[PDB]
Amino acid sequence: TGIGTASADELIAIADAARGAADGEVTSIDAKRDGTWEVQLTTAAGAETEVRVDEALVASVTSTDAADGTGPALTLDDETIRALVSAALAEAEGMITDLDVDGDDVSPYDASVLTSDNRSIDIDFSADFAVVGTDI
Amino acid sequence: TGIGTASADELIAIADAARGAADGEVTSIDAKRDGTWEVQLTTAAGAETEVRVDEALVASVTSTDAADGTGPALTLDDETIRALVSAALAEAEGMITDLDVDGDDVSPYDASVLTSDNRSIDIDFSADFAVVGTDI
Ligand SMILES: [Zn+2]
Ligand SMILES: [Zn+2]
Ligand SMILES: [Zn+2]
Ligand SMILES: [Zn+2]
Ligand SMILES: [Zn+2]
Numbered sequence A, B: 001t002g003i004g005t006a007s008a009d010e011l012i013a014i015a016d017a018a019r020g021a022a023d024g025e026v027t028s029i030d031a032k033r034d035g036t037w038e039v040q041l042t043t044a045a046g047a048e049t050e051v052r053v054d055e056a057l058v059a060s061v062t063s064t065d066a067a068d069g070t071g072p073a074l075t076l077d078d079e080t081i082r083a084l085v086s087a088a089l090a091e092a093e094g095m096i097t098d099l100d101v102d103g104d105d106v107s108p109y110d111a112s113v114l115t116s117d118n119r120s121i122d123i124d125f126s127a128d129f130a131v132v133g134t135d136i
């Protein structure tokens, strides 16, 4: 696959994560075929640790808004996200920038696709994942 | 930049991280121009949280080997990694798969570059970051 990197910033991030998991200075950084990284750390004494480094996601709360005084009928669970994404991309090719269920009740779902022409397409879908409206 | 994704697996990973940071079901996922993601969660009650989701690295120890009975003269600190990477890539274009300082003392540093021809190049460098040997 796309094993390795041309990014020194990325190798440094991998070395820094590894140094966070054990003692010693970095003596080796090696890409595994599964696209994880192994880093060797070695103490002054000569003691060795091998550390696995993986992609992870970190979540932090940004804002909070209390119960206005309704809840969501529909939600973006995994199944619904997979359905919207295939529907959004069938309609227009590009990168999904936005999904929501906010929507407008006859069109409960929205997606935005960013296309190579750096042009942004807002799509409105029915409960049945049918395209009901676009905005280009 | 390359904002968004065509990957439903990636959107699901973003939704899952977010659900790990607050209560409620996912009602929106939106890409920011800095290439972070914002996710809205909404409770049955109608209470909203916005959650920032970021790339992170996670490190876990894999193996341990005690002080054999020497330590490393040289180490891959950030400066040394930036130096090796530019030297490795000047010599051959492609993805770095390996850096080490293990080396052979007149050639203390090693890099492997994976090239588009899916061909793997081992480079040996002096203390001065000069190319001293290749293996193709
Ligand atoms: Zn899941
Ligand atoms: Zn469902
Ligand atoms: Zn809508
Ligand atoms: Zn819309
Ligand atoms: Zn419309």
Ligand SMILES: [Zn+2]
Residues within 6 Å of the ligand: A016, B078
């Ligand atoms: Zn640093």
Ligand SMILES: [Zn+2]
Residues within 6 Å of the ligand: B077, B078, B079, B080
């Ligand atoms: Zn240094």
Ligand SMILES: [Zn+2]
Residues within 6 Å of the ligand: B102, B103, B104, B107, B108, B109, B110, B123, B124, B125
């Ligand atoms: Zn060497």
Ligand SMILES: [Zn+2]
Residues within 6 Å of the ligand: B110, B111, B122, B123, B124
């Ligand atoms: Zn070598």
Ligand SMILES: [Zn+2]
Residues within 6 Å of the ligand: B124, B133, B134, B135
């Ligand atoms: Zn040689």
